[PDB]
């Protein structure tokens, strides 16, 4: 060969290894991280994203009074100096002090003796794994992180001889690095557990660390979370002595009646992993985060103040991080604490940040979630995310409350805010800020996730589980109501859905019918737990070895066999192969006598019966191992045991066909 | 000048390049780190890592009993039960 | 790291010789053919000319309108280029670089400027 | 038979904007070896020039990511994700398939958009 053509392929070995190293670096730096699933639990009934989603889409304002059950003396702890705060309503978890100790394996005592935030945060991350399409139990094992952004907001008070009842546990229930310990504890993860306090930047920062995590390949999926929870009324106390709370409580995010910040509970989880592990896996994609950064301010005026240079720098750092021109992303979900010295300084380092360049028909629209629900605090840079997700799925932008006017304290002449909700060539992109009192500025951006049959199998179950009973009828009566507002789904995704990428639990039901009209009221009676023809229930044996049993004659009736055989194509497999194995000995086939072709033997004859039971029996069994039930032990009765001799494999298929046919001959 | 001098100067620039991209990923994935600097106050009266460095070669069992400047009950908290509500049963720690 | 730093540039006289040197680093020199290429001030780049290296027999080749005037030569010892103009003429004044490959110039030298006139 | 290239002799960006100079050959570049023998060099004001792009697609290592060239046969672009101040000077796209080559031609000038 000429030297030319030698070093040709040489030339093309090294340019394509380079292209691949230079692959490499940029999914090792720039990598798309893509969210899976979320899971949020906000004050206003928020339980779902859905419900996060329907709630500010509504316009709905989730502020109400303090709680009565948490042991505050309300009633005097209010005056509009010393020690009192002049707010009465707030965003607030009613049903913090909810939690299925039982579900987790986790006690009463330690239930109560544990910090509300851990409570919140395991039922958070169990929701989030499950819509992201994954069964928790079967992440056992595996490489997956936990970033939570949580704080010690003080529920056991160890400044103050811890109580008596929770005692031992004011340790393991109250550390802030428990928070994101107990999750992967609970759930079997392999990846590192690492709480973060950042005050109000923690869960944004849990965020980019489980995206730098995941570009390394130290995970394979991760938690990005947050949780903020109120023992005590401390943080309104606390903030009542400087004019930072609001009057009347509501967070007048970027408008000119801004006069200070409510604060608020919430914990909100997201799933995330690589985006080419997602498509790889086939999950579900709800967004995309490109990029992310995080930086100080330093030198501000004063510890707890802000400062418009470190934000534009964060946000410039977060849009080259992910490889975007300012004017790609079309919206922004500012942090709008509401406070007169926050919102300004937030404002102008939007404004210089964002609105620059972009052309004169498309201004920036920024929103703030916490004018709903308050400022969630370490969960709001998490939520913020979570109300993006929902809007670029939905397609609009809700509306920001309480906006009479734009604050007149920035040049808005670019930038506009979310007055009333606006609706939506190139992907859907909007960046999210949860910028601390710490001075930890945090961003991300987010992008709408890329654009993504088999035949319909009759009779397919479906399946439902739970611990116990009640949640049983629980499961049933939430599967019913999820179908009701839903346009004619198809059965057989419901019951893989529910087959896969569920846990199996210990009380267990069934649904198997053939017709889209009994479903329903299976689902009811369910509900209920009246019996249904089409139901079935029972509670699952924890261990057991499995047999197969092979009666003798009395198990024949004339069809037997012939719908399987059209249907069922392994069995029909099975039956041709029983076939060819008796055609040998004797003087018909299989197939004629199972379908009643004219002119075969019907079952009378003792000679023909016996042969066809074996067939029949030995194909069912070996349908029933191909649907991966193996056999533990087998056992016959009579000409049975000839067939349980087929499926020890001590008898090969010719040799059980000759011997059941040569004795009913004979 | 014919193709066989041509390809030779670009197989060249095309090997030094993935030698460049292969340096710059493993010196975006396992980089050496260097510690240029170093603090500690540990107890034992340790102020520095020289302080340290003597505490450990030295032997030192750096191990005293509570503060009495903090409002601790120290007195009433021993109680060598390992059971009782509210009670050590240890007297000496690593105090800074 | 890869370095080309020339020298020996300046003013002369019309039809007067100089000498052009480019002094490589970092690299094996033997192996890069080195070429010159010349920037008029106002034009575009020009290629003066280049030489292969010393295992292809460091032949040298010129450009059309600098054919015998000028020349190429190299020193693996002490890894230098040189460019030899001989008869300069007023044209010649240019930016002069010094470019490791021959075909392919993936590096620059820092560029020498020479001036021609009476 | 000598190989031309025609390229636009100007193109003002803005510092951010994607811009794309392109460059149309009189002859068929490809190889037969399957190779697009084509060079972006990149004279900035006052300074040596560099090179940007090898053989149409590869890029020079130590060049920025943003710099991406493309094309075939005869039709090529040179593609910036992100125009900076700095990279504004002269680009020159020039083959490589036929030789001796006289001059790097007129060049492409860049400068700041207003």
């Known amino acids: 060969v000429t030297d030319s053509e030698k070093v040709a392929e040489y030339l093309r070995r090294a340019t394509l290894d380079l292209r691949a190293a230079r692959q490499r670096i940029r999914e090792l730096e720039s990598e798309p991280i893509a969210i899976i699933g979320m899971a949020c639990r906000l004050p206003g009934g928020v339980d779902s994203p859905e419900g996060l989603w329907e709630l500010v889409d509504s316009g709905t304002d989730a502020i109400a009074g303090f709680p009565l059950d948490r042991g505050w003396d309300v009633e005097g702890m209010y005056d509009p100096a010393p020690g009192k705060t002049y707010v009465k309503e707030a965003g607030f978890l009613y049903d913090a002090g909810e939690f299925d100790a039982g579900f987790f394996g986790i006690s009463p005592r330690e239930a109560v003796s544990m910090d509300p935030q851990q409570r919140l945060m395991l039922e958070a991350s169990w929701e989030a794994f499950e819509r992201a399409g994954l069964d928790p139990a079967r992440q056992r094992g595996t490489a997956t992180g936990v970033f939570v952004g949580a704080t010690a907001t003080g529920y056991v008070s160890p400044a103050a001889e811890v109580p008596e009842g929770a005692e031992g546990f004011a340790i393991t229930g109250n550390m802030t690095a428990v928070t994101s310990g107990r999750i992967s504890y609970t759930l079997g993860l392999q990846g590192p557990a690492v709480t973060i306090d950042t005050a109000c930047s923690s869960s944004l920062v849990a965020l980019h660390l489980a995206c730098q995590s995941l570009r390394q390949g130290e995970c394979t999926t991760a938690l990005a979370g947050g949780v903020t929870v109120m023992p005590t009324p401390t943080a309104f106390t606390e903030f009542s002595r400087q004019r930072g709370l609001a009057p009347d409580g509501r967070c007048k995010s970027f408008a000119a009646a801004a006069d200070g910040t409510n604060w608020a509970e919430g914990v909100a989880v997201l799933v995330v992993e690589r985006l080419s592990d997602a498509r790889r896996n086939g999950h579900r994609v709800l967004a995309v985060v490109r990029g992310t950064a995080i930086n100080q301010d330093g030198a501000s005026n004063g510890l707890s103040a802000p400062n418009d240079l470190a934000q534009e720098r964060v946000i410039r750092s977060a849009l080259d991080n992910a490889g975007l021109t300012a004017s790609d992303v079309d919206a922004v979900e500012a942090h709008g604490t509401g406070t007169t010295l926050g919102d300004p300084i937030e404002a102008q380092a939007l404004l210089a940040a964002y609105g620059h360049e972009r052309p004169a028909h498309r201004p920036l629209r920024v929103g703030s979630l916490k004018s709903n629900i308050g400022h969630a605090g370490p969960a709001a840079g998490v939520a913020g995310v979570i109300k993006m997700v929902m809007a670029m799925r939905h397609g609009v932008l809700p509306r920001s409350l309480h906006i009479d006017e734009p604050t007149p304290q920035v040049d808005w002449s670019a930038v506009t805010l979310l007055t009333e909700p606006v609706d939506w060539d190139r992907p859907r992109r909007a960046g999210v800020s949860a910028f601390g009192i710490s001075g930890t500025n945090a961003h991300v951006i987010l992008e709408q996730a890329p654009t993504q049959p088999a035949p319909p199998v009759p009779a397919a179950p479906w399946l439902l589980s739970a611990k116990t009973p009640a949640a049983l009828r629980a499961q049933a009566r939430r599967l019913h109501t999820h179908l009701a507002r839903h346009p004619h789904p198809d059965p057989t995704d419901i019951a893989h859905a529910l087959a896969t990428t569920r846990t199996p639990h210990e009380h267990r039901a069934a649904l198997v019918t053939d017709d889209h009209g009994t479903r329903g009221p299976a689902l009811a009676a369910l509900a209920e737990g009246a019996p249904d023809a089409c139901l079935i229930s029972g509670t699952a044996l924890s261990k057991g070895r499995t047999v197969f049993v092979f009666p003798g004659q009395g198990s024949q009736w004339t069809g037997m066999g012939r719908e399987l055989l059209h249907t069922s194509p392994e069995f029909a497999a099975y039956i041709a192969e029983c076939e060819t194995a008796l055609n040998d000995f004797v003087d018909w086939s299989l197939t004629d006598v199972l379908r009643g072709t004219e002119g075969a033997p019907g079952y009378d004859r003792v000679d023909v019966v016996q042969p066809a039971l074996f067939a029949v029996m030995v194909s069912l069994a070996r349908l029933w191992q191909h649907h991966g039930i193996h056999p533990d032990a087998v056992i016959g009765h009579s000409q049975g045991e000839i067939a349980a001799a087929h499926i020890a494999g001590a008898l090969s298929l010719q040799d059980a066909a000759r011997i059941v046919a040569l004795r009913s001959q004979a | 000048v014919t193709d066989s001098e041509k390809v030779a100067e670009y197989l060249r620039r095309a090997t030094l390049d993935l030698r460049a991209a292969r340096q710059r990923i493993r010196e975006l994935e396992s980089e050496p780190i260097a510690i240029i600097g170093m603090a500690c106050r540990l107890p034992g009266g340790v102020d520095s890592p020289e302080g340290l460095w003597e505490l450990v070669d030295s032997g030192t069992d750096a191990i005293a009993g509570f503060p009495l400047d903090r409002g601790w009950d120290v007195e009433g908290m021993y109680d060598p039960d390992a059971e009782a509500p509210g009670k050590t049963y240890v007297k000496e720690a690593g105090f800074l | 790291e890869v370095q080309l730093v020339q020298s020996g540039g300046g003013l002369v006289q019309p039809g007067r010789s100089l000498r052009l040197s480019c002094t490589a680093s970092?690299?094996?020199?033997?192996?890069?053919?080195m070429s010159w290429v010349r920037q008029a001030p106002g034009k575009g780049l020009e290629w003066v000319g280049f030489?292969?290296?010393?295992?292809?027999?460091?032949?040298?080749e010129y450009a059309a309108s600098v054919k015998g005037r000028f020349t190429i030569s190299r020193d693996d010892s002490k890894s230098i280029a040189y460019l030899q103009m001989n008869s300069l003429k007023t044209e010649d004044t240019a930016v002069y670089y010094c470019?490791?490959?021959?075909?392919?110039?993936?590096?620059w030298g820092q560029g020498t400027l020479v001036t021609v006139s009476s | 038979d000598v190989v031309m290239t025609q390229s636009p002799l100007s193109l003002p960006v803005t510092p951010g904007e994607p811009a794309s100079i392109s460059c149309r050959s009189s002859?068929?570049?490809?190889?037969?070896?399957?190779?697009?023998?084509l060079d972006w060099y990149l004279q900035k004001p006052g300074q040596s020039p560099q090179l940007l792009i090898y053989?149409?697609?590869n890029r020079a290592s130590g060049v920025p990511d943003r710099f991406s060239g493309s094309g075939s046969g005869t039709d090529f672009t040179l593609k910036i994700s992100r125009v900076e101040a700095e990279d504004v000077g002269v680009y020159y796209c020039?083959?490589?398939?036929?030789?001796?080559?006289?001059?790097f031609g007129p060049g492409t000038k860049v400068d700041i958009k207003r």
């Open positions: 470019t490791r490959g021959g075909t392919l110039f993936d590096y």
């Open positions: 002859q068929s570049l490809l190889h037969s070896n399957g190779y697009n023998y």
């Open positions: 020039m083959q490589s398939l036929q030789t001796p080559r006289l001059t």
């Open positions: 030489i292969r290296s010393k295992a292809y027999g460091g032949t040298t």
């Open positions: 970092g690299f094996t020199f033997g192996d890069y053919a």
């Open positions: 053989l149409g697609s």
